Design a binder for this molecule. Sequence first.
Ligand SMILES: Nc1ncnc2c1ncn2[C@@H]1O[C@H](COP(=O)(O)OP(=O)(O)CP(=O)(O)O)[C@@H](O)[C@H]1O
Ligand SMILES: Nc1ncnc2c1ncn2[C@@H]1O[C@H](COP(=O)(O)OP(=O)(O)CP(=O)(O)O)[C@@H](O)[C@H]1O
Ligand SMILES: [Mg+2]
Ligand SMILES: [Mg+2]
Lengths: 211, 202
Amino acid sequence: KERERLEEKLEDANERIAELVKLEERQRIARDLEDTLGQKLSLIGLKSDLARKLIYKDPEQAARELKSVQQTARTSLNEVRKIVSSMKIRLKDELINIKQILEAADIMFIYEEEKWPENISLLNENILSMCLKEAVTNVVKHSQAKTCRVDIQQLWKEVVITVSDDGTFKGEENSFSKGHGLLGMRERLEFANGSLHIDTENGTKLTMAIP
Amino acid sequence: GRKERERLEEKLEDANERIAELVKLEERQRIARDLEDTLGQKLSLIGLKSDLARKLIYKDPEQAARELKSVQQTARTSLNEVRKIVSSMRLKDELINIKQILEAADIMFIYEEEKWPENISLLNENILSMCLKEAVTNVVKHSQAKTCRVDIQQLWKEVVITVSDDGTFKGGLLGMRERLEFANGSLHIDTENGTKLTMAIP
Ligand SMILES: Nc1ncnc2c1ncn2[C@@H]1O[C@H](COP(=O)(O)OP(=O)(O)CP(=O)(O)O)[C@@H](O)[C@H]1O
Ligand SMILES: Nc1ncnc2c1ncn2[C@@H]1O[C@H](COP(=O)(O)OP(=O)(O)CP(=O)(O)O)[C@@H](O)[C@H]1O
Ligand SMILES: [Mg+2]
Ligand SMILES: [Mg+2]
C-alpha cells in the first residue's frame, strides 16, 4: 500500500503531461491566429480606409489598394483553412497524397501492403500522417533518391512507419531547423511517448513509432 | 489475478484513451467550427463587398465608399472574433471580473475567503473559471437575486465552487455541465432556496 501511492503520484503526472501539451497546441494556435490572421485583418482595415480616401481624387489607385484588400481577404481565408486542417489527416489518405508527390518527383513508390494496425488512436493516427507529409516532403525535396519505401506496420503496442530512400543526406548539426520540419515531427513523436529515429547509414531511413 | 486481473487495467487505460480523444476531437471541432463559420464567412463578405466597391468607383463613388465603410467594419468584427478565440486559448482573475459584474448589477457580493486549493490543474482551473462566468452571468441576468455568495473551497480530491443566490428560478448551462462531466467533476443545482450552483473538480 505504498506502491499504490507511487501509482497515484505517477498517474497525477501522466495526466499533467496531457494537459501541459494540449497547451502546446493551444498557445501555438493562438500564436498563428493572433499573428498571421490578425495582422492580415488590420491590413485589410487600413488599405480599405486608404482606398476610401482615394475614391474621389485618385480612383485609379483606390482600385489598386482594393485589389490588395481582395487578395488579403483571400490569403486570410486560406490561412484559416490551413489552421482548420492542422485541426482535422487520414492515414490511408496521406498514402494516396504522397503516392502522388513522389510519383510526380519521378521517384519510385515501393509500398508493400501489410497489416493495417488496430492499436492506434486518432490523435496518434493524425500525427503519424503529418510526419508522413514532412518525411516524404523532405525526401522529394532533398534526398536525391530514386526510390522510396514506406512500411506501415502494426508492431506490438504501437504502429511503426519507416520511410526509407537511397539518396544522400544533406544534413549537418544545424540542419535540425529549430522548431521546424523534422524538429516538429520528432518533438511531436516524443510527446505521445512514441519516437523518431533516423539512420543515414544507407541513404536515409526514417522511422516512426506510436502506441 | 495479476495476469488476468492485470489485463483489465489495460482495458481501462485504453477505454480511457478512447474517451478523452472525444475532448480533443470535439474541442478542435468547435474551434474549426467557429473559424470556418463566423470568420471565413466574414472574409468572403469582405472579398465580395470590395469587388463591388471596385466596380462602383467610377460611376457610383458615393456608394463605393459605403460598401467600403462596410469592408472596414467587417475586418474589424473579424479581428474581434479572432480575439474571442485567442483569449479562450485565471481563477483569482475571474473573481475580480464577476466581482465587478454583480457589484454593477446592484447585487451583493458575499465572498468569505478560504483555503485556496492545491490539488488543481490548469485545464481544471480554467474550466472552473468559465463555469464561474456563466453561473454569475446567469445570476445577474435572470435570478432576480439581491445577494450572491461564492464559496471557493479546497475540498478533498477536488476544488468546489458553489455560487448561491436568493432569487427565483426561471427554468450556457449545458456547456458548463457537460464540460464538468468530461473531467470527471460534476455540476449540481439546488433550486430549493433560490438557486444554488455547485462545481466539483479533481
Ligand atoms: N532525405 C534527405 N536527404 C538528404 N538530406 C536530407 C534529407 N532529409 C533531411 N535532409 C537535410 O536535413 C535538413 C533538416 O531537415 P528539416 O526537415 O529539419 O528542415 P527542411 O529543410 O526539411 C524544411 P522544414 O523546416 O519544412 O523541415 C534538410 O534541410 C536537409 O538539408
Ligand atoms: N441564475 C438563474 N436563476 C434563475 N433562472 C435562471 C438562472 N440562470 C438561468 N436561468 C434560466 O434558465 C434558462 C437557461 O439558461 P442558459 O444559461 O442556458 O440561457 P440564458 O438565458 O442564460 C442565455 P445563454 O444560454 O446564452 O447564456 C434561462 O433562460 C433562464 O430562464
Ligand atoms: Mg523537412
Ligand atoms: Mg446563460
